[PDB]
Amino acid sequence: MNFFSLHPNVYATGRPKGLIGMLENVWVSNHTPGEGTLYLISGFSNYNGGVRFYETFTEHINQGGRVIAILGGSTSQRLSSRQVVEELLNRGVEVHIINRKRILHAKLYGTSNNLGESLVVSSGNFTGPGMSQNIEASLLLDNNTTQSMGFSWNDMISEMLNQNWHIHNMTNATDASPGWNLLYDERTTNLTLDETERVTLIVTLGHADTARIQAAPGTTAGQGTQYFWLSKDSYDFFPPLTIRNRRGTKATYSSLINMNYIDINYTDTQCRVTFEAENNFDFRLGTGKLRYTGVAKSNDIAAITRVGDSDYELRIIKQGTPEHSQLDPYAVSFIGNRGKRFGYISNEEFGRIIGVTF
Amino acid sequence: MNFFSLHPNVYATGRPKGLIGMLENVWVSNHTPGEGTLYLISGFSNYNGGVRFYETFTEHINQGGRVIAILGGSTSQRLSSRQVVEELLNRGVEVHIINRKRILHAKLYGTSNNLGESLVVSSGNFTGPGMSQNIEASLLLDNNTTQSMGFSWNDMISEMLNQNWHIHNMTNATDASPGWNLLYDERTTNLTLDETERVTLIVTLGHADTARIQAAPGTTAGQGTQYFWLSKDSYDFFPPLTIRNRRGTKATYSSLINMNYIDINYTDTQCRVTFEAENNFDFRLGTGKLRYTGVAKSNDIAAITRVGDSDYELRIIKQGTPEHSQLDPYAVSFIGNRGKRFGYISNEEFGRIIGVTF
């Protein structure tokens, strides 16, 4: 069967609700690890664009499969990052970088094996924004439809490799490989946060989020892991999630960020945001600094405002207050199964609503 | 039948070789003017992105159909131009601009008519580069495929307009509409021509191109409209083609450029480049300044080198010469029945073939 999605959460004809969902179909739900070849073609790429799938690629390759990535690169434009490429190569992905005045602009993903070809054509790059909040269209075609059309990955990739283009095969790259100069460094960011990044995440809180916050100081009810559970698809809202779990543990990808907890007048400069890549793909924010403080309870909202690449402010928006009534409608998308919702709002307008100039 | 293309001329499952071909299909070959609705959704748009299809839309609207365009806008990023939006509005197109921090990034085109829904999903924006030399993937789904999978334009568009996005309806807008601030002016360009634009078009010349150049001075054989017929899809190689013919013999779209005719040491500051939108969707260069000069013959090559946004150099590369033997293989795309070919080469590579530093 074939599927179409316009994400985030706008329109979908079936089960897959966006690019992540389409790739989950072709690379997870309808794929056997180790069979054939996974393909990813994307003009732009960054680290958080791949966190959902690095483990997928690793198991596929560990089970005898191949992964081929063809990504854009440039000395004068930020297309694909060193970080994403480092990571793909380290998993055994075969990575080719195309350098061309008119860029590789295509975004195509899928698989080829003995059974047939699957194909996802998208507007979404293999980037955090492509996988998250950009308004993106994606179309998945199944084996029967690609067969009837005559589509072949092998034939297409063979043609791409015979155009005279400047294509750098980075598989087995060393430090000397000139392909590195086509890849930008995610750690290089502008002095001030771009206007497009100046947003606040609004999320409703539940009993998991707040039990240990409400717990009387020092009581056992307050003990244990204290997280705010955030949306599964927050790839674009956080810096590169490059901090990894210890060997032998479930795979996670994290960043340390500055979290200015406004309600207790305290900045945690080691606040951890974590993507759980071998559980249920949740984002979780380590909010242990709020343990026992009482600052939040179920049905309150957390407003997490991004003010720098890695700088954030957290405010509790208390239920039954005017601010909560104006912000609760912005949490439009459901997370999990107990009524949690989230969404984003500009900092400009969040501010307007709470009385703050950012 | 469904079709897939990776353009320019890389891979294709079927007759359509690129996005223009796909759009020709859904909007022209399999369409009755005035029946139902044509749809265009594109994050980025510019004037040359639309020249192939402005008359198509005009005819469709004149025969009682609708065209709906939803385009990206931004005060700080060159998303959609004032020029393309004005042109679409002038034809009766209903244009909507989305202002969102995470932008409208989708590119999807098609129709809803009596036969059902047709859908093209692409990487290619409604821009010169998207329609020409960017490496773009495009997928066209026929009425049976869209019906089976459950895709509906009206349901999708309805959802898009109920997201609480900042969408500016530009139809019958005041000049005070905030929407206007979300468009950029295509007349404004970089201080210097970007490296990505620094390219030369190579074209083989035939009898029609040179008859009047070879004609004896003052004879009727040298009179009449004098053109080089250049290419078929050079939408990104020229400036916005916003000079129109009223009705003409047929609709055309032109720009005045500076053409330095290197072989006669003369710069024409009013050289007209013209795209013919009615007959065969061709680019022609007005080379009347060469009439009766003898500087070119059939089987010679013309090289047109872009050296600024509106500045070009023309050189005749004489057959039999080593430069001609070296440049000839760059002319890889056939135009018309008679052997004419054209293609692009970087100014850097061209400079090195002809011993010139650009």
Side-chain angles (χ1 to χ4, degrees):
Chain A
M1 167 81 287
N2 304 312
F3 296 103
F4 175 87
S5 59
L6 184 73
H7 82 233
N9 303 121
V10 181
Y11 174 78
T13 59
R15 172 158 162 99
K17 305 294 180 188
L19 183 53
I20 284 272
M22 304 284 180
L23 299 177
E24 282 179 332
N25 171 136
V26 299
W27 293 341
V28 186
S29 84
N30 286 272
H31 171 67
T32 292
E35 299 289 311
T37 298
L38 312 184
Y39 293 97
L40 118 61
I41 303 181
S42 183
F44 293 73
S45 61
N46 75 7
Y47 194 80
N48 286 3
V51 293
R52 169 68 182 82
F53 294 111
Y54 296 131
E55 258 54 57
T56 295
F57 291 158
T58 289
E59 205 59 60
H60 175 69
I61 286 160
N62 274 176
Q63 299 285 323
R66 167 189 265 193
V67 184
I68 296 180
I70 299 178
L71 306 173
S74 168
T75 58
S76 65
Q77 195 172 175
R78 295 166 64 94
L79 304 178
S80 294
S81 72
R82 298 209 168 76
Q83 287 76 9
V84 66
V85 171
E86 272 178 1
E87 190 67 70
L88 292 168
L89 288 174
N90 200 233
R91 308 309 180 104
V93 180
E94 299 169 32
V95 180
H96 302 268
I97 306 307
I98 295 187
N99 175 31
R100 194 169 173 270
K101 275 182 196 319
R102 291 273 182 249
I103 60 165
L104 174 60
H105 195 255
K107 307 90 166 70
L108 321 71
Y109 311 95
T111 65
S112 176
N113 48 70
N114 287 155
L115 292 171
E117 312 295 88
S118 225
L119 175 65
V120 178
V121 177
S122 188
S123 54
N125 296 290
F126 198 72
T127 62
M131 300 291 160
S132 180
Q133 283 289 306
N134 276 2
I135 301 168
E136 308 279 12
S138 309
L139 182 57
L140 184 157
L141 296 192
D142 64 18
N143 279 188
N144 272 148
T145 309
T146 50
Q147 194 178 226
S148 298
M149 284 171 89
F151 178 82
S152 163
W153 279 109
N154 273 166
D155 287 351
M156 185 185 71
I157 304 288
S158 312
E159 296 300 324
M160 289 178 78
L161 291 179
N162 293 278
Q163 297 302 310
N164 201 31
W165 292 346
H166 301 120
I167 315 181
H168 300 247
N169 185 349
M170 293 300 277
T171 317
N172 306 132
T174 71
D175 286 2
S177 46
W180 298 113
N181 303 320
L182 298 173
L183 300 172
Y184 73 96
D185 195 323
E186 291 192 64
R187 294 165 298 191
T188 295
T189 62
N190 39 62
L191 191 75
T192 77
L193 193 59
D194 230 285
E195 190 174 80
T196 52
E197 302 307 318
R198 297 168 170 167
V199 301
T200 295
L201 171 56
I202 299 300
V203 58
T204 67
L205 308 174
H207 196 253
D209 297 317
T210 61
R212 296 167 188 81
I213 290 174
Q214 282 302 309
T219 54
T220 34
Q223 281 168 18
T225 49
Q226 165 52 40
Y227 300 124
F228 283 0
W229 300 82
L230 279 28
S231 179
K232 279 172 287 284
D233 307 287
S234 295
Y235 306 105
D236 61 332
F237 186 64
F238 295 112
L241 300 155
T242 50
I243 302 170
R244 294 307 310 283
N245 52 295
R246 53 215 175 151
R247 98 163 144 184
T249 59
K250 263 73 178 161
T252 65
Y253 292 84
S254 306
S255 184
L256 290 176
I257 60 185
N258 305 303
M259 188 54 62
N260 184 345
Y261 296 96
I262 299 303
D263 296 300
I264 59 169
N265 193 26
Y266 175 74
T267 297
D268 183 3
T269 57
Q270 309 281 293
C271 178
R272 194 185 240 80
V273 58
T274 298
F275 177 62
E276 282 191 355
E278 277 172 353
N279 193 11
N280 302 129
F281 310 115
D282 291 301
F283 279 74
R284 324 163 334 214
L285 184 66
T287 47
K289 301 298 182 165
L290 301 184
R291 192 190 306 278
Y292 295 135
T293 61
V295 300
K297 63 174 187 186
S298 305
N299 311 303
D300 287 335
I301 281 172
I304 303 167
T305 296
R306 197 176 191 181
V307 299
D309 297 330
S310 63
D311 303 325
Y312 301 76
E313 305 183 353
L314 189 145
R315 290 165 170 84
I316 298 305
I317 311 298
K318 291 242 89 247
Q319 57 202 272
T321 183
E323 287 89 350
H324 183 298
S325 257
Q326 293 170 81
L327 289 170
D328 187 47
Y330 285 86
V332 197
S333 297
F334 289 92
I335 301 178
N337 249 240
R338 302 161 150 178
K340 190 191 284 268
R341 303 175 278 116
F342 90 100
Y344 298 94
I345 176 171
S346 73
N347 292 351
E348 279 181 81
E349 190 59 12
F350 181 60
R352 206 285 313 307
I353 292 181
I354 62 158
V356 176
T357 295
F358 292 101
Chain B
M1 182 66 285
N2 304 314
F3 303 101
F4 175 88
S5 60
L6 190 75
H7 75 241
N9 309 297
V10 185
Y11 176 78
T13 58
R15 182 181 193 175
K17 307 303 182 192
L19 182 51
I20 288 272
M22 305 302 187
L23 296 178
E24 197 186 43
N25 186 305
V26 293
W27 280 351
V28 182
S29 293
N30 295 302
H31 186 59
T32 294
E35 184 171 293
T37 302
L38 308 192
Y39 297 94
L40 144 35
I41 298 175
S42 189
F44 295 69
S45 61
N46 80 1
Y47 192 88
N48 288 359
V51 294
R52 176 58 187 89
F53 295 110
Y54 298 133
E55 303 303 320
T56 302
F57 298 154
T58 289
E59 191 168 300
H60 177 79
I61 288 161
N62 281 350
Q63 290 294 329
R66 292 174 68 185
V67 186
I68 294 181
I70 302 175
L71 304 175
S74 166
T75 61
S76 60
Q77 190 165 359
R78 294 161 57 94
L79 301 189
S80 296
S81 72
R82 189 186 93 179
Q83 285 86 1
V84 68
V85 168
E86 287 172 347
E87 186 68 62
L88 288 168
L89 291 171
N90 287 339
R91 313 314 181 91
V93 181
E94 294 165 48
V95 178
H96 300 270
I97 309 300
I98 295 178
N99 172 27
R100 192 167 175 274
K101 286 182 181 304
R102 286 280 181 252
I103 62 160
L104 175 66
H105 196 267
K107 310 100 169 45
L108 72 142
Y109 308 95
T111 68
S112 183
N113 65 17
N114 287 345
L115 299 197
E117 316 291 277
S118 190
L119 168 64
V120 179
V121 172
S122 185
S123 58
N125 290 293
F126 201 72
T127 63
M131 297 294 158
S132 181
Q133 280 293 124
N134 280 1
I135 304 158
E136 310 280 8
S138 307
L139 178 55
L140 172 32
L141 299 192
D142 63 23
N143 296 144
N144 283 352
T145 306
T146 57
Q147 198 178 11
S148 293
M149 74 191 299
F151 176 81
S152 156
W153 281 106
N154 188 66
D155 289 353
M156 183 182 72
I157 301 290
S158 293
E159 291 300 315
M160 293 181 71
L161 307 184
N162 286 273
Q163 301 295 309
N164 298 307
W165 294 341
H166 299 139
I167 310 183
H168 295 269
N169 175 4
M170 299 307 292
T171 313
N172 296 312
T174 77
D175 276 20
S177 168
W180 292 115
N181 288 153
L182 295 173
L183 309 176
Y184 73 97
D185 194 336
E186 287 193 67
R187 293 170 306 184
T188 305
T189 43
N190 286 315
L191 207 59
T192 66
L193 186 59
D194 222 305
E195 191 60 39
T196 46
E197 310 295 322
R198 287 173 156 169
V199 173
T200 290
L201 178 45
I202 296 302
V203 66
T204 63
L205 295 175
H207 181 63
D209 299 314
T210 55
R212 311 175 173 66
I213 298 176
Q214 281 301 311
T219 61
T220 291
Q223 289 296 294
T225 54
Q226 167 53 32
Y227 299 119
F228 286 176
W229 275 264
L230 261 25
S231 61
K232 259 208 198 184
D233 285 314
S234 290
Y235 306 101
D236 57 345
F237 186 66
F238 295 112
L241 296 163
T242 52
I243 297 173
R244 286 228 60 216
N245 74 331
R246 176 110 200 180
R247 154 174 171 159
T249 165
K250 12 163 140 149
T252 66
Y253 292 87
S254 299
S255 181
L256 299 178
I257 55 183
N258 302 311
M259 189 63 56
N260 189 331
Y261 282 99
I262 290 302
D263 301 303
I264 57 157
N265 195 52
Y266 177 78
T267 299
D268 186 358
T269 63
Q270 304 261 272
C271 182
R272 190 185 301 262
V273 55
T274 300
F275 171 75
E276 163 70 48
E278 215 251 49
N279 204 94
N280 296 84
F281 299 115
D282 272 353
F283 286 79
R284 44 179 212 241
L285 190 61
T287 48
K289 302 279 182 172
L290 298 182
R291 180 193 310 281
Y292 304 121
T293 66
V295 299
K297 308 179 182 194
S298 315
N299 299 314
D300 288 349
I301 272 164
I304 297 140
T305 296
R306 189 180 201 172
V307 303
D309 172 71
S310 271
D311 301 335
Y312 299 75
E313 301 189 353
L314 189 149
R315 284 169 176 85
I316 304 299
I317 306 297
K318 278 272 160 183
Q319 58 198 294
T321 189
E323 296 85 347
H324 183 285
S325 199
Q326 282 180 267
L327 289 169
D328 195 27
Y330 286 87
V332 307
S333 307
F334 291 86
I335 13 188
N337 15 90
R338 288 207 185 182
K340 289 207 76 195
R341 292 177 283 115
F342 71 94
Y344 300 93
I345 182 176
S346 66
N347 285 1
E348 298 79 72
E349 186 58 40
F350 175 69
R352 283 178 203 181
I353 293 167
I354 68 158
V356 167
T357 283
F358 291 104

